[model samples]
Target: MVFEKIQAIIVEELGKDAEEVQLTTNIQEELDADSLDLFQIINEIEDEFDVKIETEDGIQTVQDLVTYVEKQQAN
Candidate 1:
């Protein structure tokens, strides 16, 4: 569930094909996502998942984002 939503968000934000996006996909290197892009995606993620992403949130890849959301939701 988290991955599917994240995949949509990344695809929407970066115009990347869904098929190319994976857990190992790097937001910076693979998607060319800048800080603003990250913020935009994070903002949407907060609303979609009902969780806030802090500055200290160690999100770097698609897997990180999904894990963060899952961790937060499980709390």
Candidate 2:
């Protein structure tokens, strides 16, 4: 999937505008995202794409998360 949708999801979930975010921003450190915030993101994703993000260990970066989302939807 193109990142445009993911970008929208991120900004909306975090309560921020696109200009408030950076590509390299870490969800935990930069966004101050705790477990609840993460769940909000996940919930928005599930609602937006009609897909589920399985609990796993391989997602280690923004790219990894993006790739995983695309692949998961593809499957």
Candidate 3:
């Protein structure tokens, strides 16, 4: 359930093919996402998930986001 939601946001925000994206997939390599694009993705996830992404964590990839969001979810 958690992974699905995260993957959904990535597909929606990046306009990537759903069948091509996965939890372990790199946001930039697979989705062609940049830092600015990343910020928008993160903001959308935070709003939907109701969790804050810490700046010091140095997030740059999908795995990083997966870990951060999973850690904060009610599940």
Tell me the TM-score of each prediction against the true structure.
0.82, 0.70, 0.76
Superior by TM-score: candidate 1 or candidate 3: 1
Compared with the true structure, what per-residue lDDT tens digits does model 1 show for residues 1-75? 877987888788778888878787778677676778878888878778877455235566887877777677775
- Model with the higher TM-score, candidate 1 or 2: 1
lDDT of 3 by residue, 7-60 (tens): 788778877776777666676666676787778777878877878665334675
Prediction 2 global C-alpha lDDT? 0.61
Q: Among all windows of ten consecutive residues in candidate 3, which has the lowest summed lDDT?
A: 52-61
* Residue pairs of candidate 1 with colliding backbone atoms: none
Clashing pairs in 2: none
Q: lDDT of each prediction vs. the true structure?
A: 0.75, 0.61, 0.71
